[PDB]
Amino acid sequence: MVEYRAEVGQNAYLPCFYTPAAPGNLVPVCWGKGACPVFECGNVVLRTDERDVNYWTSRYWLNGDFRKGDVSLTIENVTLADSGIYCCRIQIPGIMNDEKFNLKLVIK
Ligand SMILES: [Ca+2]
């Protein structure tokens, strides 16, 4: 687990990257609130798949290019309620092999 900081009223940046084969040949990724569970993400805030961003909402979005493996999460206009641990999960095809990144956001 690695810790990151943001300020109230600004945007949070939570880095998360992998190296894909090609822009149209990606690995599905999920983000969730809470430490990464055994499988999948809990409390999902964003999802991508082999070609598209399939799930996002007004305050949870990507500022970088997911087709290049930049799956870093932006949380827009944060409040103290956004403090906590987030999971970035790189859902490599196969069993028991995802990359599970735990990110703690501290907000002041
Ligand atoms: Ca897997």
Residue numbers in the entry: 1 to 108
Task: Reproduce text from the manuscript describing this model.
T-cell immunoglobulin and mucin domain containing protein-3 (TIM-3), also known as Hepatitis A virus cellular receptor 2 (HAVCR2), is involved in regulating innate and adaptive immunity and has thus emerged as a target for numerous therapeutics that are under clinical development. Human (h)TIM-3 consists of a membrane distal variable immunoglobulin (IgV)-like domain involved in ligand interactions, a membrane proximal mucin domain and a transmembrane domain that is connected to an intracellular cytoplasmic tail involved in phosphotyrosine-dependent signaling. Previous structural and biochemical studies have shown that mouse (m)TIM-32 and mTIM-419 bind phosphatidylserine (PtdSer) at the GFCC′ face of the IgV domain in a calcium (Ca++) dependent manner. The IgV-like domain of hTIM-3 has also been demonstrated to bind other ligands such as carcinoembryonic antigen cell adhesion molecule 1 (CEACAM1), high mobility group protein B1 (HMGB1)20 and galectin-91,9,18.
